[PDB]
């Protein structure tokens, strides 16, 4: 998931400038629902996925407010002590616990149904147990037992006014997420949201704790220490997943790392490259964010290093070349099928050979597996979410910035080799496989393009529609399941707010009986691919100048 | 104006539009808008948090079942709806409640309001209570974005590197594959604004 936040010093004929794109994959129906909430204190616009009662993209005519994952690491692992002699029991501070239980019943369509046990200590949930260690792991939270106080923080952040009355709703938001605030004077504002556990002192957070209570949470952190910042001096507010703050600790996940290599410095250099930008100027960071490549500028220095002292004919320079004359950007040829430029064939194919000579042959097998994607994993319907920068290639990047990275290099991933022979040995390898595939014209070369897909299964491969109704689109964008757009005080209105948003397939699911789709099945479909969005309503005297239809129900409860 | 009275508008899009004049009534107007643009796929993530998919889908969805039942304690989700203020339970009641009028109106005219999935796939909706409202936001936004670990798999990377490696420099490579932080990640708040202020054990020292 993207943001970009323009404030009041950085935005040209507007105050401030939200532009959204929350990446959760694409389907159909659409992952998220537009609704207007009028009356009880609300008045709010804009679309929410699941149509939760709080709406995540939207604004309320003062404020605008939207969100990004934070992946903070909210959630450890603690090693239970088991016994033998007392089956259901661990041992905790000194005593042997009994754990709690429950029978679930799976009940199955023309099977036979399934009962299992899910037990539970005071550190969270069972995952898993080894008999043979005598030892149960359960995962805790630390936002287990506010997941109704989140929703509704998200629900009543829509009411807020200022930026105080916003955080304090923020402050009750106990799951690890990126908000981000605007408003009609221009201030703009970012807090990394969630609960997060104040662990004792030696406890690296990345591997289990024992269960027996000595490494057990003092508690949560206080609010004052989730990442925040109210009108930053650069005038702006970028994430996509990257780290909120200097010194703050990622997610444990192991192909999660916070380093060097970042996608969002794509966006930065965007935001960076005129002083002010207009609101067209924000939504079109969409479109070239969408179709970049995010290996490119990682990695052009190096081989152009390598390189620059080979002949005109070498192939391995040639490779290089063709990169360096490229910005990055992807572009469908007329076919609708292959990208103009090979650049990222290229980089897909020399990644794929590094990582195998460098990350992949330091770490043993099976953990080396870990460390070979390139980033360019995809699908027959194309990716199901955003690309990023591989894990190994974050790693990579370390290694080949030497002495400018922090991390030190315990093991030298080139083995002793001249980084430069690697470089090249991987070119070598480049070069031999896509002349095999395409042949020696590297101007003729007609790679093949990624798709998108709005699929019938949700994200838990659950169907949620019939298989037919998955929609295709022959470019993958690099962006947001929908994308959201606040302008505030703009200088062109004399509204105070203005908002656009896109929610394709469309507003509705709905088909009848006899197969007739409705009216607002696919209506954002086109508007999607073509970077396009349709105005957001707030005032009755707008939505009823653009009224279809209504109804009024009168219901007691 | 009455506070029984509920004025549902949809734009040129179909994008619906309540208006009401108490918290139950809104909601109550949001979850009948829903029900009636995106039934299946609300039921459908309904039985995806809750993992009741086999009851409709099959054997395909057993292994998927028990690991979303395993990941929750419903019971302590009930717990934290049963503590809510009535204005807060209001919330999600009504939108149950607005679910369900148009539900029963489904049910009630099926050969008309039904929609088509429901009869592909071979079932009809049932109501919704509040802790089924719960359980969407759960199921989707808590576990997917939120519940994110690998501790146990990075305790086996470590013991792996201190097996081909020895203790410290495994230890040392673990911190150069899976560093605790890196001072060059580019960060959303700038250095100038701040810093995170704790500073995190960085070589597994609870088992020291
Ligand atoms: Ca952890």
Partial sequence: ?557 | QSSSEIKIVRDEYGMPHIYANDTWHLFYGYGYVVAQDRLFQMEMARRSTQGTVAEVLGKDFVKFDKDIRRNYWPDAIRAQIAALSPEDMSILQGYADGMNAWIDKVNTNPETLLPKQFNTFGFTPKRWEPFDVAMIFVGTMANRFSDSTSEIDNLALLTALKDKYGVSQGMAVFNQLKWLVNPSAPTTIAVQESNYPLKFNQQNSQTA
């Fill in chain 1, 1 to 557: 998931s993207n943001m970009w936040v323009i404030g009041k010093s950085k935005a040209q004929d507007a105050k401030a400038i939200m532009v959204n794109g929350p990446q959760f994959g694409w389907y159909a129906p659409a992952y998220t629902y537009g609704i207007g909430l009028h009356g009880a204190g609300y008045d709010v616009t804009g679309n929410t996925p699941f149509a939760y009662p709080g709406l995540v993209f939207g604004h309320n005519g003062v404020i605008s407010w939207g969100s990004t994952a934070g992946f903070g690491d909210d959630v450890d692992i603690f090693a239970e002590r088991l016994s033998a002699e007392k089956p259901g029991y661990y041992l905790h501070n000194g005593k042997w616990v009994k754990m709690l239980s429950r029978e679930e019943t799976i009940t199955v369509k023309n099977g036979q149904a399934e009962t299992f046990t899910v037990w539970r200590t005071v550190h969270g949930n069972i995952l898993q147990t080894d008999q043979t260690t005598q030892t149960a792991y359960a995962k805790s939270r630390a936002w287990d037992g506010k997941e109704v106080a989140s929703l509704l923080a998200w629900t009543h952040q829509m009411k807020a006014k200022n930026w105080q009355e916003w955080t304090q709703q923020a402050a009750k938001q106990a799951l690890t997420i990126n908000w981000y605030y605007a408003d009609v004077n221009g201030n703009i504002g970012y807090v990394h949201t969630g609960a997060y556990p104040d662990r004792q002192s030696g406890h690296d957070p990345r591997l289990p704790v024992p269960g027996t209570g000595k490494w057990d949470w003092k508690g949560l952190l206080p609010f004052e220490m989730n990442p925040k910042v109210y009108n930053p001096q650069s005038g702006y507010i970028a994430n996509w997943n990257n780290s909120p703050q200097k010194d703050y600790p990622a997610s444990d996940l192991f192909a999660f790392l916070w380093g060097g290599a970042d996608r969002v410095t794509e966006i930065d250099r965007l935001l960076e490259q005129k002083p002010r930008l207009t609101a067209d100027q924000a939504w079109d960071v969409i479109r070239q964010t969408s179709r970049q490549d995010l290996n490119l500028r990682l990695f052009l220095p190096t081989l152009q290093a390598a390189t620059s002292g080979l002949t005109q004919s070498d192939p391995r320079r040639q490779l290089v070349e063709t990169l360096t004359r490229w910005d990055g950007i992807n572009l469908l040829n007329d076919d609708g099928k292959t990208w103009q430029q090979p650049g990222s064939a290229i980089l897909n194919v020399w990644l794929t050979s590094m990582l195998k000579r460098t990350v992949v042959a330091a770490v043993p097998m099976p953990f080396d597996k870990w460390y070979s994607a390139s980033g360019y994993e995809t699908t027959q319907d194309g990716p199901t979410g955003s690309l990023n920068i591989s894990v190994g290639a974050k790693i990579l990047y370390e290694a080949v910035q030497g002495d400018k990275s922090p991390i030190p290099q315990a093991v030298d991933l080139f083995a002793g080799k001249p980084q430069q022979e690697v470089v090249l040995a991987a070119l070598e390898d480049t070069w031999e496989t896509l002349s095999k595939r395409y042949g020696n014209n590297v101007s003729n070369w007609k790679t093949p393009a990624m798709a998108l897909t709005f699929r019938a299964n949700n994200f838990f491969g659950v169907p949620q529609a019939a298989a037919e109704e998955t929609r295709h689109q022959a470019e993958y964008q690099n962006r947001g399941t929908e994308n959201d757009m606040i302008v505030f005080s703009p200088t062109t209105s004399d509204r105070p707010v203005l908002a656009w948003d896109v929610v394709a397939p469309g507003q509705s699911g709905f088909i009848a009986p006899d197969g007739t789709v409705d009216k607002h099945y696919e209506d954002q479909l086109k508007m999607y691919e073509n970077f396009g969005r349709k105005s957001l309503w707030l005032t009755k005297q707008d939505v009823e100048a653009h009224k279809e239809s209504q109804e009024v129900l009168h219901v007691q409860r």
